[PDB]
């Protein structure tokens, strides 16, 4: 989607293997604020909004 019409996807009731993201070489920018991505594997959340 266009930036002015950014799409929002809700993530819930699932297991998030964040390794697939932070072990991938397909990303040039990967910046997490307020969290460290390694520790995401040990964390749960009530709302995920991609």
């Amino acid at each position: 989607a266009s930036v002015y019409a950014w799409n929002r996807k809700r993530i819930s009731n699932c297991v998030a293997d964040y390794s697939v993201l932070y072990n991938s070489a397909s990303f040039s920018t990967f910046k997490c604020y307020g969290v460290s991505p390694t520790k995401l594997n040990d964390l749960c959340f009530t709302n995920v909004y991609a």
């Binding site: 307020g34 969290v35 460290s36 390694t38 520790k39 040990d42 964390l43």
Partner: protein, 49 residues
């Protein structure tokens, strides 16, 4: 109320302690007032700050 002079003393001490305990609930500028959460959410580079 006759023994107020004694009661006051007690109360004051208690009050002090209470505030001290409640000071554990303040972030003081951090991102969370619970040390365990900061240790579980950040790596040392910024967890130290």
């Amino acid at each position: 109320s006759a023994l107020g002079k004694l009661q006051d003393v007690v109360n004051q001490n208690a009050q002090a302690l209470n505030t001290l305990v409640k000071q554990l609930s303040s972030n003081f500028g951090a991102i969370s007032s619970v040390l365990n959460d900061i240790l579980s959410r950040l790596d040392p580079p910024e967890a130290e700050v």
